[PDB]
Every structure is written in structure tokens, then in C-alpha cells.
Design a protein around this ligand. Structure first.
Ligand SMILES: [Zn+2]
Ligand SMILES: [Zn+2]
Lengths: 42, 83, 304, 353
């Protein structure tokens, strides 16, 4: 797939994957354990 | 292409097809060797259960209406599950 | 399906029907019909043996017509084995076919060029060829015959040039036979080929047998570094009630922003805080009738 | 804000904090830091000494002194001398101090360039139109009897924790939670903050609460509809990030701090509902009757009425007796609260050690 271009013929194949690829802290508001909800996202 | 795909039903490989043109629509399942053919009546379906893409086991569950009727569809590709 | 997929399917079918035997044709057509196959899949569909499919798999792997996937799964009986999945990488396969046919025609052209060289000689006793250049250094004192270096035998003429027209006609008979292949590559080169892989080939998968030990569900790993539409049909009668409900919602919005009673007026003078129509319709219907006579195991759950 | 509002590249910007001490390598750029970091007379670390040498050896073209009211302090004054800056801009919302050093800023920074008309900005929708109020809580007989025969420090906590203030705050929380308002309750006394929060079942945030817990409680206040009231100590007075609130209750305060009083008002002055017609935010200063809390509340409200706000007194809340649950309605509960408030106040030798 990288030597077809060296010969003028267009390859339909891209080069393969061989050539060039890549705490829990303490709580103080103990009177609402479970009333508050976790928000890891907006 | 979106209405057809490979699937496993009751630990038996098969193909899931959508008969959308007929009223009511039918989700027929054909065994590959022709041993059995399974069909689902879509009018008597209450809710659809699915598994997230993070889960390794790929399973799809159907729930019917009146002991409710339950069907289980195991798939092999996630894009087939999406369609 | 996709016409370009039809063209690549016909191209692989033509190359396996032309340059490969019938068992190779059956294997490649099984892959082109059922997209991903394992060993037991092909064995069940074709009634073929493991050593019988040996050279077939070896040739279509060496010629890159079939790629192999080394995925092992976990069946419920826990007797797992590292099965191999046979499938096709379309762009790699067509590049391999292109390279093979181009090297075939280039090697045939170079053989034709070598046949364009004059005949030369070959000593039958020693079975060694002798070109025309080295024949002159080995001619006799009589200037009449070319004698061998070792056998000292009069050289006889080879056939480099007599078969040159034969090699050219072989090239011509190769060229019209390979013409559908080059036509397919002409149509492919004018189009875009999607680089399929193991995951892409599973999209168009058709399973071959029921009790297949090969689970086609792919398992990705870590560490390897090699919406809905809903409608509100109304007969324009309940829509007035919907407008009244929106008016009620507006009233609730007004009540939400209402000024408190201790803000709108002074609290000093107050105490300190601390601890029958139906029979009528029947008569009209009877009158209308009189008039008419007058004209007459549990898993993860998702809300989908 | 520098990286967002203007075309300043991040390699031109730098931060001088405890965690971050690397400087911009370009010939010009931005440094942002803290007053205490620049004006640290203590033995600072070697890297911080290098950064301070870089700041002092560079002639700066502009210094921005955010919250300039803390500049007239002891060695916060020295930041305008240790940094050779051509232009000095002081940005603040509370240009008041309880001493006379607020007038020294014209010697430090420069003249008062622009006084913003707060009522002009409120009538144009730029800031919230708050309804400032002052709820008068009549002190009970036994609490006032204990209030007269006590020292000032104990008198403070004794007038903060009167049960009529509990009832008024509970009724206001209930009423403004029915109205769907985000309420921030301010009280500088930590013990009173905890007691009010435990009595009313609402989360509280103060100094020793962990920062992840503070962030979680702030996110719950901003997003969870069941969390509409968070109690805050003096942590909320200073410049920390807070969700938008439309109601405020001031249970206690730090003497007659006009700066703190106007800083607390600023946390409800930027509410999102300003575009809504007829929207009003609410400020409540719950103060106990016939105490020094009247004197301190009037001293605090002097700056806000200088801005032009009208603090309407509230000696009556309609529906105090009709509320379902009253905090310390029974005399025995008030007596128990009174008792509680009164009872508030050679390698081998190394194995030895
Ligand atoms: Zn490398
Ligand atoms: Zn010879």
C-alpha cells in the first residue's frame, strides 16, 4: 500500500497498523448522607 | 441493511429480520440451518431492555404484555445492535 | 448492497475461479457469502477436512485473499479454545491482486525482452548455455565452428528468438483473459474502497450453523500496544382546554413571582412575630322526522 | 477570564501560587497571584524567592488590585511599593473599611475614578433588584435575662441563638423554598451555623469542611432541586465561587462590617433571572430586638443606604403560628436550648524513635 505509489499505480489500501500508528474524603454533613447526590458532570 | 443482522437466540445462531412493510410489523428470526423460525408480534410488546456498550456480554431483551412474555436476543456486533 | 462491494466480490470471484482450483473457489465464495467464518464454520458448510483446508488457507493467507483473527472467547461450557476467524480485507486483497498481476505482466515482458536477444548456443555434452558474445571467443582455428571450453564440442544453436513470437502470443492470450480483472480495477480505482477490518466484516455477517462454538462478539482489551418523536392528535376540541392549562401555568408563574405580604405593606401595626334538554332534542328530532316524512438470569437494564 | 475574554495566549500567562510557580518565558505577559503571596514577609521557598525576584526586577506596565479594600492593611500596603508598576487600577465592590485607612488608597493607588450608581444598574437590569429587609426578632424572656448578666463574647452567641430568630429563619426558608428561590444563609458564628443547619436539615459550608465536600454541596445547590438552601459561614463572604441565589438570610454577622454586609449582598446581585419581568431578589438581616445587634445591623446597613437601598423593617411575618413545625415552640425546648447555649461557654540507636 506504500509501494504502489512508488510505481505509479494508485492503491485503494491505506498503510496498515505496522508502519506508523500510535479519592474518597470525609463527610461533615452527616445528617444528609444520601440526600445529596453525586455530580461528576454538569 | 439496517433491518438485517446476525444474532444468537436461545444460544442458537441466526439472523434477525424486520418485516416493517406488514401491519403489524414483525421481527422474525430464522435459524441458519433452517431448524426453527421464531417470530415476534410487535403489537404485544411492552418495553425493550438493552445493555450498554461498555458491557462485554451483548444481550437484548424483549418484554410482552398480559406472566409477561419475555424474549432474549444475543448479538455479535454493536452496530447491528444500534440499528 | 453497495455496487462497489459487488465489483470487489466479482473481482475476487474471478481471480479465484481463474488462478485457483475449485476448493479455493468454494472457500472464497463461502467467505464472500458468509462474511466471517471460523474453522468449524467452513468445515460444516463444505464437509472439508482440517488438513484439506490447510493448503487453501495457507495460499489465501500468503496471497492475502483471506485474513485471520486470533480471538478467543469464553463459551458457557468453559471449554474455550483459541479459535481463528477467516475473513477478507478488501483493500489489502485488491492491492495484492494488483501487485501480482503487475509483476506477472512485467516478468512476461522481461522474458519477452530476453527472448528478443539472439539465439546464442548451448553445448549438449556439458548442458551449459553460451551467448553470442562468448561464442566468438570460443571459435576454431578454421573460423568455422564454435567449440566448447570444457567438452571441446561444436556448439549447437539455442532457441532464443524462435519462441519470441510464441512468448508474445502467450502475452496476448494472457491479456484478453485478464481483461475483466483490469476492467474491475479500472472501476475500483475510480471509486473509494472502505478499509474493512474484523469489526467491519462482522456488520454483514451471516452465521453458517446453529451450534457454533465461535462467538463472533468481539472483545476489546486494554494494554495491547502493538430521539423519539411523539405527537398530539386533537380534534380541535380539547385544544381550548390545553390553552386553559397554559393559562393556568401562566397563573402559577405569576404566583411564583408574587411579592411577599411583609414587603408590599408595612407590618408595624400588626402583632409581633413569635411562637330538560334531552327531551327538547327528542322533540326536535321528531319534528325533523315529520318534515322528512312530509318530503317523502438478569443483566444490565436500559430504558430504550 | 483573561484566557476567555481576550486574545491572550496561554504561554503569555502565568500563575504565582503554591502549586504553580513557573513564569512566562516571553518578553511580556501576564502574571496573576495573591496579595499574601507577594507580601509574604515569612521565609518563602527558594523557587518563590526566584519568582519574586523576577517580579521585582521587571518594570510592570499595569497592576490590577482586585478587592482593593484589603490593600490598606499592614503589609498588604507594601505590594504597591515592592512592584514597580506604571499604572495601578483598583477594582472592588466594597470600598469601605471599619477604620480610617480606606482614605489612604488615594495615596496608594489613586483617586476614586468611577462610582457605579447601583440603582441605575438595577433599574437597567444589569444587576438584580434586591428587596432589602431587616427582620426584627423579639428576644425571649429567659434568653434576655441571661443576656443582660453576661460578658460581650457570650452575649454575642446568646443573641444569635434566640429561638424567635430560629422560627423566623425557618419560616422564611419554607416560604422562599415554596417560591422556588435559591437561598444562601449567612452566619459568621460557626456553632450557630451548625445548629441552625442541623435544626432545619440543610447543608452547611464553613472553613474546616473539606474542599471536595464543599464542591459537592455547591453542585447539589446549583443542580439538585431538593437542595435549595445552603448555610454559609464567612467563607461565603470572601471571593469564592458560588451558585446563583435569589434569597439571602443573615443570621449573624461580624460586628458592624459594612464590607462584609455589602459582600453578602453581592452574592444575590448577579442572578440569572434579571431578564424576567417582575423578578426581585431578597435580602434578609435577621437581628434580635433590643440588643447590640440593632446597633451593628444599622452600622452595616449604613453603607447600603448610602448606596441607596431601603431596608424595610419586618416586625411581623404573616403565618408564623400557622407553620406546621416551629423550631423551639415549646417552653421546654427553649429551656433546653438555653441550657445548651449556656453550657457552650549511630543508625542503630534510632530504633528508639
Ligand atoms: Zn516508533
Ligand atoms: Zn560443453
Amino acid at each position: 500500500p506504500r509501494k504502489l505509489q512508488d510505481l505509479g499505480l494508485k492503491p485503494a489500501s491505506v498503510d496498515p497498523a505496522t508502519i506508523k500508528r500510535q479519592r474518597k474524603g470525609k463527610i461533615t454533613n452527616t445528617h444528609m448522607t444520601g440526600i445529596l447526590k453525586d455530580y461528576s458532570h454538569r | 441493511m439496517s433491518h438485517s443482522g446476525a444474532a444468537i437466540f436461545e444460544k442458537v445462531s441466526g439472523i434477525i429480520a424486520i418485516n416493517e412493510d406488514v401491519s403489524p410489523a414483525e421481527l422474525t428470526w430464522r435459524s441458519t440451518d433452517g431448524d426453527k423460525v421464531h417470530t415476534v408480534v410487535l403489537s404485544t410488546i411492552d418495553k425493550l431492555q438493552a445493555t450498554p456498550a461498555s458491557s462485554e456480554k451483548m444481550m437484548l431483551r424483549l418484554i410482552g404484555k398480559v406472566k409477561p412474555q419475555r424474549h432474549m436476543f444475543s448479538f455479535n456486533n454493536r452496530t447491528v445492535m444500534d440499528n | 448492497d453497495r455496487p462497489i462491494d459487488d465489483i470487489v466480490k466479482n473481482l475476487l470471484k474471478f481471480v479465484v475461479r481463474g488462478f485457483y482450483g475449485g476448493s479455493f473457489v468454494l472457500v472464497l465464495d463461502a467467505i464472500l457469502f458468509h462474511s466471517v467464518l471460523a474453522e468449524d464454520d467452513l468445515k460444516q458448510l463444505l464437509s472439508i477436512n482440517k488438513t484439506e483446508l490447510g493448503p487453501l488457507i495457507a495460499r489465501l493467507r500468503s496471497d492475502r485473499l483471506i485474513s485471520i483473527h486470533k480471538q478467543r472467547e469464553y463459551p458457557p461450557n468453559s471449554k474455550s479454545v483459541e479459535r481463528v476467524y477467516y475473513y477478507v480485507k478488501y483493500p489489502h486483497a485488491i492491492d495484492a491482486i494488483k501487485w501480482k498481476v503487475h509483476q506477472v505482466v512485467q516478468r512476461l515482458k522481461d522474458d519477452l525482452d530476453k527472448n528478443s536477444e539472439p539465439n546464442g548456443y548451448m553445448c549438449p555434452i556439458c548442458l551449459t548455455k553460451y551467448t553470442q558474445l562468448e561464442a566468438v571467443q570460443l571459435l576454431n582455428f578454421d573460423r568455422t565452428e564454435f567449440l566448447c571450453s570444457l567438452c571441446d564440442e561444436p556448439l549447437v544453436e539455442d532457441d532464443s528468438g524462435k519462441k519470441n513470437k510464441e512468448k508474445q502470443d502467450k502475452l496476448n492470450r494472457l491479456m484478453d483473459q485478464i481483461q475483466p480483472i483490469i476492467d474491475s480495477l479500472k472501476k475500483i480505482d475510480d471509486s473509494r474502497i472502505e478499509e474493512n477490518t474484523f469489526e467491519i466484516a462482522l456488520a454483514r455477517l451471516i452465521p453458517p450453523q446453529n451450534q457454533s462454538h465461535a462467538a463472533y462478539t468481539y472483545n476489546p482489551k486494554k494494554g495491547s500496544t502493538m430521539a423519539t418523536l411523539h405527537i398530539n392528535i386533537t380534534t380541535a376540541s380539547d385544544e381550548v382546554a390545553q390553552r386553559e392549562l397554559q393559562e393556568r401555568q401562566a397563573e402559577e408563574k405569576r404566583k411564583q413571582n408574587a411579592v411577599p405580604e411583609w414587603h408590599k405593606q408595612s407590618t408595624i401595626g400588626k402583632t409581633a412575630l413569635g411562637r330538560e334538554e334531552r327531551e327538547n332534542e327528542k322533540t326536535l328530532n321528531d319534528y325533523y322526522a315529520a318534515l322528512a316524512k312530509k318530503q317523502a438470569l438478569e443483566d444490565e437494564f436500559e430504558d430504550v | 477570564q483573561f484566557l476567555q475574554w481576550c486574545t491572550l495566549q496561554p504561554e503569555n500567562c502565568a500563575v504565582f501560587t503554591s502549586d504553580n510557580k513557573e513564569m512566562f518565558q516571553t518578553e511580556s505577559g501576564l502574571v496573576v497571584s495573591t496579595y499574601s503571596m507577594v507580601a509574604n514577609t515569612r521565609n518563602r521557598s527558594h523557587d518563590s524567592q526566584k519568582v519574586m525576584d523576577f517580579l521585582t526586577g521587571r518594570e510592570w506596565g499595569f497592576i490590577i488590585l482586585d478587592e482593593v479594600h484589603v490593600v490598606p492593611a499592614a503589609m498588604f500596603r507594601r505590594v504597591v511599593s515592592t512592584i514597580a508598576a506604571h499604572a495601578k487600577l483598583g477594582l472592588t465592590a466594597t470600598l469601605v473599611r471599619e477604620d480610617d485607612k480606606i482614605g489612604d488608597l488615594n495615596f496608594l493607588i489613586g483617586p476614586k475614578l468611577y462610582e457605579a450608581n447601583w440603582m441605575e444598574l438595577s433599574q437597567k437590569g444589569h444587576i438584580a433588584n434586591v428587596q432589602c429587609a431587616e427582620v426584627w426578632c423579639p428576644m425571649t424572656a429567659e434568653f434576655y435575662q441571661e443576656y443582660l448578666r453576661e460578658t460581650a463574647r457570650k452575649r454575642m452567641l446568646l443573641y444569635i441563638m434566640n429561638p424567635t430568630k430560629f422560627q423566623a429563619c425557618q419560616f422564611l426558608i419554607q416560604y422562599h423554598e415554596r417560591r422556588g428561590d435559591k437561598i444562601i444563609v449567612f452566619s459568621d458564628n460557626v456553632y450557630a451555623l451548625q445548629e441552625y443547619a442541623l435544626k432545619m436539615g440543610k447543608p452547611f459550608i464553613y472553613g474546616s469542611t473539606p474542599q471536595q465536600e464543599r464542591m459537592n454541596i455547591l453542585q447539589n445547590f446549583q443542580y439538585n432541586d431538593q437542595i435549595n438552601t445552603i448555610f454559609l459561614s464567612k467563607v461565603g463572604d470572601t471571593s469564592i465561587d458560588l451558585p446563583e441565589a435569589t434569597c439571602l438570610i443573615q443570621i449573624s454577622s461580624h460586628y458592624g462590617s459594612r464590607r462584609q454586609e455589602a459582600q453578602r449582598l453581592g452574592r444575590i446581585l448577579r442572578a440569572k433571572r434579571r431578564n424576567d419581568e417582575g423578578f426581585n431578589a431578597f435580602f434578609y438581616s435577621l437581628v434580635s430586638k433590643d440588643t447590640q445587634e440593632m446597633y451593628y445591623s444599622t452600622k452595616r446597613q449604613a453603607f447600603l443606604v448610602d448606596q441607596g437601598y431601603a431596608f424595610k423593617v419586618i416586625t411581623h411575618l404573616h403565618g408564623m403560628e400557622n407553620i406546621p413545625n416551629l423550631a423551639y415552640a415549646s417552653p421546654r425546648e427553649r429551656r433546653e436550648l438555653l441550657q445548651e447555649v449556656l453550657l457552650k461557654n549511630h543508625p542503630l540507636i534510632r530504633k528508639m524513635y
